[PDB]
Amino acid sequence: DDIYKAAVEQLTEEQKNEFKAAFDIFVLGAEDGCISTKELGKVMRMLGQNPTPEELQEMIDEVDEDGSGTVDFDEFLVMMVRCMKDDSKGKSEEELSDLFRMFDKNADGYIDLDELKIMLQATGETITEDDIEELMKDGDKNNDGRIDYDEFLEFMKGVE
Amino acid sequence: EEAEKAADESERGMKVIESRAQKDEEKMEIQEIQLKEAKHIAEDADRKYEEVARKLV
Ligand SMILES: [Ca+2]
Numbered sequence: 001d002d003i004y005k006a007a008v009e010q011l012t013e014e015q016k017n018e019f020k021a022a023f024d025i026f027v028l029g030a031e032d033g034c035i036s037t038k039e040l041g042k043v044m045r046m047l048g049q050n051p052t053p054e055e056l057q058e059m060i061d062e063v064d065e066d067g068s069g070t071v072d073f074d075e076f077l078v079m080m081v082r083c084m085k086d087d088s089k090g091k092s093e094e095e096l097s098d099l100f101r102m103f104d105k106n107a108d109g110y111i112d113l114d115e116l117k118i119m120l121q122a123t124g125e126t127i128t129e130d131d132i133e134e135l136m137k138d139g140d141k142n143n144d145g146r147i148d149y150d151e152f153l154e155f156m157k158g159v160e
Numbered sequence: 161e162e163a164e165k166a167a168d169e170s171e172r173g174m175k176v177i178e179s180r181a182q183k184d185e186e187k188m189e190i191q192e193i194q195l196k197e198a199k200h201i202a203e204d205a206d207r208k209y210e211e212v213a214r215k216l217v
């Protein structure tokens with residue numbers, strides 16, 4: 001969703017207008033005003049490829065932000081921009097160890113919230129408290145107050 | 161006489177092709193009804209499948 005929404009916001013206005021037009025084309029005559037498994041499969045047939053039902057479910061689950069089981073415009077942009085794989089080309093294991101070490105400056109084996117916050121402060125961008133909390137949750141899985149190396153590895157999916 | 165022959169054949173062509181066109185119209189209506197019914201059934205089946213999959217998980 002991270003790279004997806006980033007690419008979405010990177011779209012231009014004319015592109016988003018074409019996306020809205022294509023959405024109206026896909027939901028043309030629909031009954032829920034959104035693209036569900038039925039409408040997505042209909043579009044896939046209209047194209048040529050055939051999609052597995054479980055695959056259609058898993059895809060709609062990888063684009064929704066609401067919880068409707070259907071694809072709306074806000075999710076149409078994600079479903080129409082996810083093509084480029086932004087989170088590919090994972091950094092080398094040595095580079096990952098370097099990342100963990102420099103995030104664990106005091107040499108302890110854990111990236112406490114203080115290190116993450118000072119890092120966000122150092123980056124220079126205006127860090128919002130909500131951003132801090134969301135990143136802290138994304139890293140620290142068990143919510144013990146620190147990001148270990150396994151939780152840090154988990155922090156690298158959707159990141160590049 | 162040739163013109164009369166052509167006129168008679170043409171009248172028959174009108175009757176048969178108009179019957180064809182009406183049959184095509186009825187078949188299009190029937191096909192649209194069947195398509196809509198199949199689409200609604202597929203939507204219902206997909207919703208029930210999603211529910212059953214959640215329950216299964
Ligand atoms: Ca949705």
Ligand SMILES: [Ca+2]
Pocket residue numbers: 103104105106107108109110111112115
């Ligand atoms: Ca530390």
Ligand SMILES: [Ca+2]
Pocket residue numbers: 139140141142143144145146147148151
């Ligand atoms: Ca933790």
